[PDB]
């Protein structure tokens, strides 16, 4: 896996297949987390 993509050597990132017709649970969702004096 020394710089060469192949079997058992995968690129670490994968995109989401977001489409308007892709059910409910496969739709894109916007998430904001507000993590907790000024």
């Amino acid at each position: 896996c020394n710089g060469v993509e192949g079997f058992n050597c995968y690129f670490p990132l994968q995109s989401y297949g977001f489409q308007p017709t892709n059910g409910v649970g496969y739709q894109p969702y916007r998430v904001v987390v507000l993590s907790f004096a000024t």
Partner: antibody
Amino acid sequence: VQLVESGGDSVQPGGSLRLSCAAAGFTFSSYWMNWVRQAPGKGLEWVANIKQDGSEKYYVDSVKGRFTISRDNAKNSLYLQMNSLRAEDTAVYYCALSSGYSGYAGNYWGQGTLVTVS
Amino acid sequence: AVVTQEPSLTVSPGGTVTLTCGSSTGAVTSGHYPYWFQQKPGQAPRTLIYDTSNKHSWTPARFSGSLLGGKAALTLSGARPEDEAEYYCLLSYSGARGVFGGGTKLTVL
């Protein structure tokens, strides 16, 4: 991951030509090394392969007995020699690196070298 | 050692694509570990799909290395003008002596 292929030139039919490919940016002797050729205006034709350690070689039947592959793991490169080269064998030859499950087909491709026979 | 493809496909921008490939005998399965390549004029062929369905890092995620009814395919979820290219398939057989299909030309309307 770069594959540098050369050796293509204008040659006469009935003769022979040795093509070569050098590896750069990756380990040579960990992957299978492929050869593919494409005649202008045509699709891709499978020509040959060689196993990681050179113990096995594979050819498309159409070049069997004419094409030979050898390699030098200390130079990170391989050579393809084609004997009894036909006038019909005008094509760009490409070097490809196979890191897949079986090693039969390449993932990375070089720029190719043109072989013209006249 | 015979592989066939649909000679050409025309797709409207944003439309889907189904490019197909297969062997004259048996059926295409994961055991053929099918490969798909894309070639633009002046360029070397670039592998998009390897080992049936694995997609490369340089390949747009709009492309999908799916299989059909005993056939290999390369589909698109929405084609773009940038995708105009000749596409090629390669199947394994009894060993590492693969056979390419005739080539399938994809254009965008």
